[PDB]
Design a binder for these strands. Structure first.
Ligand code: CL
Ligand code: CL
Ligand code: MG
Ligand code: NA
Ligand code: NA
Length: 153
RNA sequence: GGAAAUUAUAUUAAUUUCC
């Protein structure tokens, strides 16, 4: 039905329609490792403070980094149920990384699984080779992406 | 039809805007 270019443009439109973002393989990897740096020890941050922590540190290598773009990455993890959220009446909620997502491998798998879930919600059928290219810019994460698809079905 | 920024406690709702 759709060629690869069409599947890709429709995938990123569906991601952006949920207030989520993928910043590209290198920038997304660094954004997620900064989320881990802030939260792996169980610190409880508001969205404001997590976004500040990650943006200003990305900015030198990735001048495109904004509150908006990094907020959209944090929203992808939020939609993925990666955070334990503490509500505070008439105040900002605090967020902690659930214990099972306090390594890069586990957090990155949950992140990837959520983008595949968005593809499934949007009716976009994308093969593991295209997923590896989209999320990693290489063909060395095909088996990883295949595993994620099969665990979602 | 697509994109960016900005706001918010968002499994999200809007605003503004340079195609
Ligand atoms: Cl498939
Ligand atoms: Cl935007
Ligand atoms: Mg505005
Ligand atoms: Na939104
Ligand atoms: Na969450």
């Amino acid at each position: 039905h759709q060629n690869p270019q069409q599947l890709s443009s429709n995938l990123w439109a569906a991601v952006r329609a949920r207030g989520c973002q993928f910043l590209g393989p290198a920038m997304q990897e660094e954004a997620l490792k900064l989320v881990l740096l802030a939260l792996e020890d169980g610190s409880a941050l508001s969205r404001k403070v997590l976004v500040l922590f990650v943006v200003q540190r990305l900015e030198p290598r990735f001048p495109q980094a904004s509150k908006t773009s990094i907020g959209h990455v944090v929203q992808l993890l939020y939609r993925a149920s990666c955070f334990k959220v503490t509500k505070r009446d008439e105040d900002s909620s605090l967020m902690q990384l659930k214990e099972e997502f306090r390594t890069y491998e586990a957090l990155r798998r949950e992140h990837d699984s959520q983008i595949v879930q968005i593809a499934m919600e949007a009716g976009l059928r994308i093969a593991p080779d295209q997923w590896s290219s989209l999320l990693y810019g290489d063909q060395s994460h095909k088996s990883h992406m295949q595993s994620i698809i099969d665990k979602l079905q």
